[PDB]
Design a protein around this ligand. Sequence first.
Ligand SMILES: Cc1cc2nc3c(=O)[nH]c(=O)nc-3n(C[C@H](O)[C@H](O)[C@H](O)COP(=O)(O)OP(=O)(O)OC[C@H]3O[C@@H](n4cnc5c(N)ncnc54)[C@H](O)[C@@H]3O)c2cc1C
Ligand SMILES: Cc1cc2nc3c(=O)[nH]c(=O)nc-3n(C[C@H](O)[C@H](O)[C@H](O)COP(=O)(O)OP(=O)(O)OC[C@H]3O[C@@H](n4cnc5c(N)ncnc54)[C@H](O)[C@@H]3O)c2cc1C
Ligand SMILES: Nc1nc2c(c(=O)[nH]1)N[C@H]1C(S)=C(S)[C@@H](COP(=O)(O)O)O[C@H]1N2
Ligand code: FES
Ligand code: FES
Ligand code: FES
Ligand code: FES
Lengths: 164, 164, 745, 50, 149, 305, 305
Amino acid sequence: TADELVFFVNGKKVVEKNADPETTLLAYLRRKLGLRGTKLGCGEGGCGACTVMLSKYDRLQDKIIHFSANACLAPICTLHHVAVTTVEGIGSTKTRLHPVQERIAKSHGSQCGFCTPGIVMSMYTLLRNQPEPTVEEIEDAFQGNLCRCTGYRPILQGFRTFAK
Amino acid sequence: TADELVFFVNGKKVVEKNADPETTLLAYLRRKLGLRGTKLGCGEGGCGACTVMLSKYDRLQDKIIHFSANACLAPICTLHHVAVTTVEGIGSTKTRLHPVQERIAKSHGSQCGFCTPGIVMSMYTLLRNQPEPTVEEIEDAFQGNLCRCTGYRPILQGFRTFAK
Amino acid sequence: DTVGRPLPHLAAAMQASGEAVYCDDIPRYENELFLRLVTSTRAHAKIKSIDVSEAQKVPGFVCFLSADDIPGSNETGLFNDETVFAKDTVTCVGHIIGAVVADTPEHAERAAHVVKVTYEDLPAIITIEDAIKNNSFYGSELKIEKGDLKKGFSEADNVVSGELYIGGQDHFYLETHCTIAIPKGEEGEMELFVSTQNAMKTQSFVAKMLGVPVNRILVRVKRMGGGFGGKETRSTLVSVAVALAAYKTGHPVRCMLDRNEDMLITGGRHPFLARYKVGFMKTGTIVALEVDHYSNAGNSRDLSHSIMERALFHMDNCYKIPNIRGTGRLCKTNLSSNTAFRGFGGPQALFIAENWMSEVAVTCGLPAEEVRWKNMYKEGDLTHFNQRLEGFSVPRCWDECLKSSQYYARKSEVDKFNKENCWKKRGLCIIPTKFGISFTVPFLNQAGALIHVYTDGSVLVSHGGTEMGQGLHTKMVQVASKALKIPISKIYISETSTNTVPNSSPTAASVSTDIYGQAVYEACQTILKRLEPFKKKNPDGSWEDWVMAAYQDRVSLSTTGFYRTPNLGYSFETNSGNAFHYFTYGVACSEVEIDCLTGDHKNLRTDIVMDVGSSLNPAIDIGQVEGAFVQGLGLFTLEELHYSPEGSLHTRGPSTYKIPAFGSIPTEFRVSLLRDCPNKKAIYASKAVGEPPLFLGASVFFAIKDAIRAARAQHTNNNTKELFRLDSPATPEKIRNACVDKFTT
Amino acid sequence: DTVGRPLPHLAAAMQASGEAVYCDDIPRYENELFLRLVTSTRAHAKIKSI
Amino acid sequence: GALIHVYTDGSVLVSHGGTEMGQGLHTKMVQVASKALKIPISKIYISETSTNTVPNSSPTAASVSTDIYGQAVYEACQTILKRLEPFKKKNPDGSWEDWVMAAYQDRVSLSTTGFYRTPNLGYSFETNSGNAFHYFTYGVACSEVEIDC
Amino acid sequence: PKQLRFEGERVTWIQASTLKELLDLKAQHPEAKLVVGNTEIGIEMKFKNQLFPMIICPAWIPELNAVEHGPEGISFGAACALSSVEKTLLEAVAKLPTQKTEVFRGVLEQLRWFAGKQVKSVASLGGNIITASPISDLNPVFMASGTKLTIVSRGTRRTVPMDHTFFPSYRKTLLGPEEILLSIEIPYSREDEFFSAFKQASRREDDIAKVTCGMRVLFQPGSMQVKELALCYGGMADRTISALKTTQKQLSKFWNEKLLQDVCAGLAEELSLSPDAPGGMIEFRRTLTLSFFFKFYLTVLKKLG
Amino acid sequence: PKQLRFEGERVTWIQASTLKELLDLKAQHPEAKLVVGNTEIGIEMKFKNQLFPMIICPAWIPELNAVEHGPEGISFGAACALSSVEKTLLEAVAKLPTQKTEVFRGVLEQLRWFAGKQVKSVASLGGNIITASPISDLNPVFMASGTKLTIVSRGTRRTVPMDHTFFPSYRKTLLGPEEILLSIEIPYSREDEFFSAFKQASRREDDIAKVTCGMRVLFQPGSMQVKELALCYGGMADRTISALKTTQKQLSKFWNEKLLQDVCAGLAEELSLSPDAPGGMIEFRRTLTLSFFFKFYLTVLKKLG
Ligand SMILES: Cc1cc2nc3c(=O)[nH]c(=O)nc-3n(C[C@H](O)[C@H](O)[C@H](O)COP(=O)(O)OP(=O)(O)OC[C@H]3O[C@@H](n4cnc5c(N)ncnc54)[C@H](O)[C@@H]3O)c2cc1C
Ligand SMILES: Cc1cc2nc3c(=O)[nH]c(=O)nc-3n(C[C@H](O)[C@H](O)[C@H](O)COP(=O)(O)OP(=O)(O)OC[C@H]3O[C@@H](n4cnc5c(N)ncnc54)[C@H](O)[C@@H]3O)c2cc1C
Ligand SMILES: Nc1nc2c(c(=O)[nH]1)N[C@H]1C(S)=C(S)[C@@H](COP(=O)(O)O)O[C@H]1N2
Ligand code: FES
Ligand code: FES
Ligand code: FES
Ligand code: FES
């Protein structure tokens, strides 16, 4: 006699009738929903490869709020009535890339590429809260995201173009 | 409120708790139990590619009885307390081939090989009932099996070695 | 060194244990969907609507696919005259309109049955006689003509004319068409597992439909459960449908045809109608021949023209005819497009030749063997297409078959049986065949290979050929073992794939052993040259050591091999240039017993002698001879496709279509390979064996016809020199009706 | 002719959209199982039982 | 080693022993083949690295991959160019696509291996001689830091 | 054994353990489909796209599998596999005098080039009969011999010989909505009673236009004077039919050349097919009805003179 | 919103919609684990192989998310995300006189090179406090400022300033079995009250041996004479500790060079580590306790002289 968990992933309704409390959102996206853009890098919140955006109507604040989270640590059972957005939710080469995806790609901000969706989702989240950020807001947006290939310079140079 | 279907495949217990009346034994072997030696050739009982052996204790006769059947036409819902034997039940190249499998292979009785499990299972069934058959019993055991590659002569020459 | 040894098919043990993997045996991906084709029920109609409301209610329904979901091109087929999915009009009963995609094959089946189509009928053309009357043909008349026909006919004592029909044939490969398409989700990349003989055209047609470069598409074939010509082009009907569903859903998709879909949809052997006129002497010698052939091509071109070319090349059989005219037309009809089937128009034209040849002998009151032997080509003779017959070995096969079958002694005993029996008769016939070896389109006669030696000394071979039961991979391993001088246990063939050997011709025309043999041989020579220096440094070392020394000296242990069949290029204007690299020859004698009251018959005895050069594998070659012959007996005596007057196939499974059974084969069944006849023109002196023996199944047809002749002498006429028309297949209906008696009247 | 030119990594756009496939991104077969290594907790020791 | 196939549509598939790990080897290999073949990069593709296309490959390591597979790819491209040359002469103002199709129809193989072997290497720890490296890469960095003592 | 219930997306299956259950279930749900071997139902559901939302399987029921030797002949429960019928009839034929096994040997001849072992091991006798295919190889023999059918529902029990009236129209039998075929008694041959069975060795359509027959003659004691004559044919209409008009005319005639010619003329007329009769093969089929009778005619003479 | 119940193989999760539900559940199941962000629990379950068969998630409860501005300071519900705490404190800092935001700015300093946005968006305030990690960057600051904690169970309610007694042993706090942390009031700075917070920029073990501190001095009105002095350190023991012995000695002393030396000597002794204290870095950690106080010492002088 268990309740149904209802959430949204990329604008699409997910009704889970047998939610396991131990299921992380990462496991669910990859291995239940088959959305493999979100990555496992550490599973301990330090690397940000699993970054997704979350959205909810805040019963206090009024407002729809947008914020980034680490899918590796988010239990699905915390997400009832929450809207999830992953990298495939914002754009694709099949349809059209988001400006964030295009700019990280063209700016040489992606080598092996495994960190890229995570960094794309942190930048996306920043832009969804603040459409015209400062350069300073931009560098501080990524303290949660690690990249082992690039030395970071190209990524900030590319996202710098969103500022002022 | 449905009954459980219990049968055996290759010496191993299958408990199906939600049997669909429309499910053929062929579909079940291949797509449920992952046993793909048994083949679809027609689905109308004409070709024998799906031949398996069936065994039951006959509540009339006394006796355990053995007989061949077409898996394509056998509803699973007829097999409660029946033991199914497929080509993988009798021997393998990993372990050891049954004399039936060895002899059809060496006698050049297998070209594309698609009919071979079905033919192997017809011969096997004959031998399980009559360990010393006549040459005549042997040719008549295969009225239900079609082969398009061999012209049949090598198969009967191979199996002829079981007679007398 | 196992070349010339009876080595069993490499996969035979695994086929016997059910461990060998065919397309549908590959495991499903967790997200893999199933496709079912939606197909026309009218021979010729305009599509007025497609309704999917009831299909959308089937559990597991994913989507319906049609011409409007295609991203690249709806234009397909070998000559670009087909659709992937019909849009405005359907043009045969099998015609693919769309496809349902579902979560299980059972749901896909349920959903597809419930898709309702609305039609407005159009004028349909179904029979060859309909097509001649309507002038419905593809292209124009094909023709080979030699000598002077007015003049040949002037010189002739007797002239017999007639008409003859030979029905089509369903391939009836035990494994039906099957495709798995895996979309990668990157750059239009797709990987396909296919039961096809033509990985290249699969790759092309899929790329064309998707509007994507050919380099994105990887087609893989491990083995087919039979092909027989049926998967040389027609496989793409399923493959492209399944590539589309994969593209559209983003999931892996598969489909394997149920028997009844396969038979209706994928086409079979061409029905032939022949009108003929032969001029001959009182002696039996042919002086003039005129044959117009008509093939029922169905609703597209496909391979129909090439089939008709091969038919014109084979209208002589083994007979020297100084004045000859053969023409062929391809009939455009509202039937499923017909295609390659073992023999590729050959058997049809060879059946027509043996028919008028049987009638020459009855008209002359001469023994059939005598009339054939006297009209037979000699060594060095040219054909009606002006190709010299070098190493013509039919006479050797003939004399050897007469001896072994004890023909003349059994002719007496047949006549004794007929004198002593009233409602049962026996028949006896000896028949020759010759079959030309090559693709008739010269550019298909190319073959590639790729060989890798790994550092443990193990070898991986890849060539353009596909395995469909004929033991091509077995023969290729035997060739590589002989060429490399290592045990067969060191060499492995895994699969055929478009990323190892590109641009490969279809596995077809009986030439695979020949062309891939050579390409593999050539790759092995390259390896041997590279390993030669190390072999000198260490003459008493092992293969393993020479290979490791080569690796460590940074000598590449990977090579391509390529073969191109020399001296080919026939011209239909000029009537010159070689059509074939060489001919495969054979002779069969058969005896039957007919029940004149039922039309039922017994196959009593068959003796075959085939010229297959120096066989690379006696056991495989004898198995090809037997298998082919039984497919021919099916063609000529048992297998009959049947359509409604509206052009809808009735015969769609083994209950209504009878291929030969265990109990169909001759009681005494003898095959011999001719000794001491090495072929200079092919790998290790071997000859092509796949297709040539199928027509020898006609010895059963003409033995039946001889028996009918005897029943007719018993109960119908006193006219010996009577001709009656017997079409193929001579089924019990046709046999019984020909035994005219107090009951038929 | 692009040699000497600052051409972006060919896969960089698909990496940015999460479309580029890495090993664990390949779909699972229906019958696919998962492995986990069992590892030593001692630097140097005799194994007495498992 | 390398293996290249030109399909009949003029599309090219490249395979070499190198693996992609983010360093842009495949990008660079596609650039090299575009240059050597004289066709746009959009016509060439690298799918994956596999032991059934290129055997016995060395690890993707030592910073030499662009160097060695660049050469092997280049060589395979030269073989394709030689084979296509007659058809280029027969149709000097045609397109790549036409030369490739004419080659296929004349039964010219549009598949080739390429191989490269670094010359003049072999250093001995006895004698202390023979080249250890083909060449050296050089550089210089200047850095400034501030420490909180 | 107890009754089992299986439930699918579309179909509910009940495995009856007992005759009483079967008859109760059948009376509660007259539209329920009996399935035994499913060698016909499986074809109907897959290929003719029939759906039977409710199925009962009576294969477990002891009465429907019973093989009994009586004074009149051998009775077989309706669920007996064709292989079991064939084994029993082979054993009867080897043991009994030839004169008593004319029908048994007719049954066995029709079973000779029937399906393979896989089909005969699960295909039931009652299933073949109630299928009522126009080209059934068994219903002509059963009709010609007057094989006795026991037919039961809740309350009701009745035995009837199989005759022309049992197959009223296409694919239909003379059972009520609530009735099931319990058993089938294949009769012993009497003195002066002779029987043959013949068949076309090949169908071309799924269920029409394949000629198959059962032929019986009973003579007056020690004579060649016809007392009874039954010529039954499959493949000649949309049902198994009896040539009654033809054979009624031969009652108390002698087995001679004149009878031969009179039967052939009766047959040619009574069983005549229109030129576009479903299934074609119009000439051949006609010739077979006459040729088969000739076969019977000559065989009877050898069993006499 | 209503209470939701999820059941897995090992764990039962209850999403509480209401404070009452939370306290009732917590009293019925005192062993139940509260999870808000899961940034600690998820690590405990994955890496330290803890299993908590019963979990309550109170994130929905309005009281646990309430941000209140009172006379004493800013109160935050225990479930407030660190990002919300940071946004509120930045807003407070920009609006209020510097003299009232000494603690707020010390909280913000510890939050500067804390985790990334992804963690700070879900990691709660009450979660960091009750985790009670020896190296928490926040508990030293809360301890130094005497941040007030509201602690509730069924019936019981109590507010306590955080002090040394709150963290009695490793990973343990002064909550009963049935209690939850409700809210946290981060105090306004008073006149003559000064505050600093410092931290080691790097841990090496998961939860020990990273030096982090919160430092408060309150002077007598208008003077440099110490009235209150609180020096609180993480990374120096298996818990957040206060240098009480050292600071008690400085009461009513003057902020001079003599105080500098006395505090450093007190610190070096009171917080001394054994050579093999868990986590090593013995010399460095010592040096940082003194260097951090020196930094406070100089900063205080600049805020004065
Ligand atoms: C490959 C093949 C070849 C065949 N060849 C021939 C042939 O050559 N000649 C020939 O005559 N037949 C032939 N058959 C038909 C076959 O013999 C029959 O399908 C079979 O006997 C039907 O029995 P079943 O047990 O499978 O019945 P099912 O499919 O389970 O049922 C058949 C019908 O009988 C009904 N039924 C079953 N039992 C009873 C009962 N006792 N009371 C009332 N109704 C009942 C069912 O409702 C159903 O409508 C062939 C079949 C196959 C598949
Ligand atoms: C990679 C990353 C970096 C980090 N860096 C730092 C850092 O630099 N400095 C630092 O100090 N911390 C750091 N942390 C720790 C972080 O601050 C805590 O994990 C977080 O604040 C705990 O909050 P939570 O909501 O995720 O707690 P949960 O994981 O949900 O629970 C934490 C514990 O507190 C209990 N709990 C929660 N709420 C209550 C309540 N209201 N009443 C009673 N018990 C309660 C739970 O039962 C559990 O025992 C880091 C964490 C991560 C993921
Ligand atoms: N077992 C088997 N034998 C077979 C076939 C087949 O599909 N299976 N096809 C035949 C046909 S149609 C041809 S063209 C040849 C082609 O293969 P080969 O060139 O290797 O003989 O195999 C022949 N024999
Ligand atoms: S995988 Fe590293 S933060 Fe989630
Ligand atoms: S591009 Fe490789 S880790 Fe960021
Ligand atoms: S698939 Fe042909 S008989 Fe079962
Ligand atoms: S070996 Fe191919 S069907 Fe029998």
